[PDB]
Structure formats: C-alpha cells, structure tokens
Amino acid sequence: ERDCRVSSFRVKENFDKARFSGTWYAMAKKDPEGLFLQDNIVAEFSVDETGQMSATAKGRVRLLNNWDVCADMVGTFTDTEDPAKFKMKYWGVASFLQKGNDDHWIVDTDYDTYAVQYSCRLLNLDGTCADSYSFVFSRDPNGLPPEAQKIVRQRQEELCLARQYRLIVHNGYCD
Numbered sequence: 400e401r402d403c404r405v406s407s408f409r410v411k412e413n414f415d416k417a418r419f420s421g422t423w424y425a426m427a428k429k430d431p432e433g434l435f436l437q438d439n440i441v442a443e444f445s446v447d448e449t450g451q452m453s454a455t456a457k458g459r460v461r462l463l464n465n466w467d468v469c470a471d472m473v474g475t476f477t478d479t480e481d482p483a484k485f486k487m488k489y490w491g492v493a494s495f496l497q498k499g500n501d502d503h504w505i506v507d508t509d510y511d512t513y514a515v516q517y518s519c520r521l522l523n524l525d526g527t528c529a530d531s532y533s534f535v536f537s538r539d540p541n542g543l544p545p546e547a548q549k550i551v552r553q554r555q556e557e558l559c560l561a562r563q564y565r566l567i568v569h570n571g572y573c574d
C-alpha cells in the first residue's frame with residue numbers, strides 16, 4: 400500500500416541553510432550497514448560567506464567492548480536542483496586523505512526544535528532503499544515539543560522506517 404520508493408520521498412520545501420546552522424543533538428537513529436557512530440552524537444552545521452553548507456559530527460564509536468574512541472568527523476555539502484537534497488563528502492579528521500560520499504536529505508525541520516535527516520546508500524531494483532540511515536535531531540537534548548513529536552513520528556513512518564529507530568544517549572562522553 401505505502402509507496403516506499405526513494406524517488407517518491409518528499410523533503411524540506413525551500414530548505415534554508417542559514418536557519419539550519421548551529422548545534423543539533425541526535426536523539427534517535429536508524430543504522431545503515433557497517434561501522435557507524437553509536438551515541439553522544441552532536442552535529443554542528445555552518446554556512447560560510449559564499450553560501451556553502453558544511454558540518455562537523457562528534458560521537459562515540461565502538462572498536463571493541465573494551466575500547467571506544469570519540470570520532471571527530473567533518474562534512475562538506477554540495478547543492479543540487481532540490482534545495483533540501485545535498486551530496487555530503489565526509490571524513491574523519493585523522494583520515495582526511497580517505498573520504499566517503501553520501502546523499503544527505505533534510506526530510507523535514509522547523510529549524511528551532513527538531514529535524515529529520517535521511518540517506519540512501521543503495522537502491523533495490525524496485526526503487527526502495529536497500530541500505531539507509533536516518534537521524535532525528537533536536538536543538539534541546541532534553542527532548543522534543545508535542546508538535547515536533549507528532550511530525551517526527553509521521554515522517555519516520557513515511558520513510559518506511561517505522562519502529563526501526565533506536566534512541567541515543569548523551570553523557571558528555573566526548574567533551
């Protein structure tokens with residue numbers, strides 16, 4: 400019944416880079432395959448004079464049960480036809496020689512309480528996503544207001560990721 404094709408997904412109409420800048424706290428996430436930030440995930444977006452968006456993400460990464468590292472990462476975004484859909488060239492500060500490259504879609508946001516982000520790394524033949532990740536961001540790490548809660552839940556379901564998100568802890572672990 401539900402249309403889960405990635406090309407059918409709506410994103411933030413008239414997305415505004417300047418308003419989106421500043422600190423964002425990831426409170427929930429749906430994982431992709433492979434190694435990935437685990438928790439204490441804080442993103443700091445910013446827009447330079449020329450108007451190109453970039454961001455830094457810090458977070459705990461599990462190497463062993465015995466060993467974690469606070470991985471500082473950096474991202475730089477490239478605009479497309481759609482102002483909510485970017486191409487994020489990203490990397491760890493140590494491994495800056497080595498870089499990854501993802502879709503980065505701002506699915507929805509109100510700029511001052513919540514944001515829903517999404518990325519498809521691989522399509523199935525039917526157009527649905529085979530490997531996706533999604534962050535639920537918040538300006539306040541104590542939670543989202545009632546209207547944000549309703550919207551996030553609605554968007555999570557429309558991305559066909561209902562009940563696939565997991566809550567993320569914030570402990571000042573990477574301060």
Ligand SMILES: O=C(c1cn(Cc2ccccc2)cn1)N1CCN(c2ccccc2Cl)CC1
Pocket residue numbers: 434435436442454455456472473474489490491497498499500
């Ligand atoms: O946890 C990961 C991650 C790490 N990897 C491994 C990796 C592959 C290729 C290069 C560096 C690291 C894959 N996904 N991500 C979550 C954070 N994301 C990111 C990075 C910088 C700014 C903003 C974001 Cl959302 C990058 C993707």
